[PDB]
């Protein structure tokens, strides 16, 4: 039902200065914090209105953590380049994905942590939250370092404790936007393609969260091949948009019906032309 | 709040 996720991106840029570290925080599909080492004096910036109520003690602590991670990932980029015997001229990326998933009840459902190198799985925390899965012999060196540092033990305690604890706090402070689902504004349109065939299109706009399913039915069947359903896209104001189109024989555009499924709507909604 | 343990790979 609810989740907190942190996204890290460490990119090396030889000849273009020191490596760039970007840290982004999320509560479901809503971004609430951002950090960029690129600035003259980098600091954690609010990205949601419900996180602005946090005291200066919160912001200075978050800035201290991400400043430490900036330096950590600079050494990690240097070490991983050595493990793969890579050139000092090439640009490489270390990505990290970690967080805690909360059930409909409000309890820890699943804790997770994953790290990548150049868009490839590198090291990941197992489902037991006690062991690591290394992708290769290079990731094994990282695993041994992380085992000696007791990363898995302190990460488990964070994911079971503070992660859940702060996610619950954020959900309460922003209950008017995070715990409130926005239903899609549905409407179908006019569109011809040939003299014998036309194109019916179903529109879904201004919905939150991004999870939605748009299907076309010629008297109840599914047309997976013959449905150009476009990928869910952000509107720009924290809402989303999606559409589905069908190749239709002119005259038969009345036995075609669109089914929209979202958590904003109480039960599936059906609309025609 | 993010994870407060920064470990070099």
């Amino acid at each position: 039902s609810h989740s907190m996720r942190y996204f890290y991106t460490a990119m090396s840029r030889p000849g273009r200065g020191e490596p760039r570290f970007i840290a982004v925080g999320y509560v479901d599909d809503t971004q609430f914090v951002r950090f960029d080492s690129d600035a003259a004096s980098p600091r954690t910036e609010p990205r949601a209105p419900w996180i602005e109520q946090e005291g200066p003690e919160y912001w200075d602590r978050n800035t201290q953590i991400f400043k430490t991670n900036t330096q950590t990932y600079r050494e990690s980029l240097r070490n991983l380049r050595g493990y793969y015997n890579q050139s000092e001229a090439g640009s490489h990326i270390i990505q990290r994905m970690y967080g805690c998933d909360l059930g409909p009840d409000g309890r820890l459902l699943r804790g997770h942590d994953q790290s990548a190198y150049d868009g490839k799985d590198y090291i990941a925390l197992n489902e037991d939250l006690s062991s690591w899965t290394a992708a290769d012999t290079a990731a094994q060196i990282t695993q041994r370092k992380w085992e000696a540092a007791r990363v898995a033990e302190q990460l488990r305690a964070y994911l079971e404790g503070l992660c859940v604890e702060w996610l619950r706090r954020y959900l309460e402070n922003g209950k008017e936007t995070l715990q409130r689902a926005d239903p899609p504004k549905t409407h179908v349109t006019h569109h011809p393609v040939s003299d014998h065939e036309a194109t019916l299109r179903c529109w879904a706009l201004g919905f939150y969260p991004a999870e939605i399913t748009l299907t076309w039915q010629r008297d109840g069947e599914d047309q997976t091949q013959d449905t150009e359903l476009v990928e869910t896209r952000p509107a720009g104001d924290r809402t989303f948009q999606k559409w589905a189109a069908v190749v239709v024989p002119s005259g038969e555009e009345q036995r075609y019906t669109c089914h929209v499924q979202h958590e904003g709507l109480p039960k599936p909604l059906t609309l025609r032309w | 709040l993010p994870f407060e343990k920064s470990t070099i790979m």
Partner: T-cell receptor
């Protein structure tokens, strides 16, 4: 952010001794123990991140996060064990808080 | 192990004192601590490679800590005062914070009039 441990503790040679530690902090990441001789380097004994017992030879350390309590147990006490024992708390990041220390006196 | 020099240092009020720390090779993290009689080490400054990530524990700007090559670290105390009299311990961790710390034998500093 602070932590409390007894000032002194005394035990006979060959016996066992317990050094208690309670911590008072906003965040918790780990509880560790260090041995320090007069004008010497503090040397690591054991680290507790999760609840339970850590065993390393004659020395063991327990931790209860819910009770914000931990202790160090030293078995088969020797004359060389007469030193200062410090419990350290990790609260996230890198800043470690150390206690005043417990001076152990091993009676010969 | 971690080494420190000098073991003992007696200084006159107003003098500049230089403290050296040679950590274990490859250890990314470096810590500086102050230790008063009958007390535990109190945090001064933290280094990850050559970058000084925090110095909130330093008593004043007179305390200048550096690690330019990301290995050997120096703590220079400008215009030493009697209040600076303490044991200055240095520690290192292999890959970051919240880890096992490896300490040096320290420097027992005494500042007199």
């Amino acid at each position: 952010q602070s932590l409390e441990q007894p000032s002194e503790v005394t035990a006979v040679e060959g016996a066992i001794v317990q050094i208690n530690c309670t911590y008072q902090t906003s965040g918790f990441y780990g509880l560790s123990w260090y041995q320090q001789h007069d004008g010497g380097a503090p040397t690591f004994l054991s680290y507790n991140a999760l609840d339970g017992l850590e065993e390393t030879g004659r020395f063991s350390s327990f931790l209860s996060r819910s009770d914000s309590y931990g202790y160090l147990l030293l078995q088969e006490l020797q004359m060389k064990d007469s030193a200062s024992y410090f419990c350290a708390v990790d609260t996230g990041g890198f800043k470690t808080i150390f206690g005043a220390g417990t001076r152990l006196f091993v009676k010969a | 192990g971690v080494s420190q020099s000098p073991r003992y240092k007696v200084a006159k009020r107003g003098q500049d004192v230089a403290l050296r720390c040679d950590p274990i090779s490859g250890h990314v993290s470096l810590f500086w601590y102050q230790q008063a009689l009958g007390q535990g080490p109190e945090f001064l400054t933290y280094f990850q490679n050559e970058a000084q990530l925090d110095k909130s524990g330093l008593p004043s700007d007179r305390f200048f800590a550096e690690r330019p090559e990301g290995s050997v670290s120096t703590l220079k105390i400008q215009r030493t005062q009697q209040e600076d009299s303490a044991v200055y311990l240095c520690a290192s961790s292999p890959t970051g914070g919240q880890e096992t710390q490896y300490f040096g034998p320290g420097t027992r500093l005494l500042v007199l009039e």
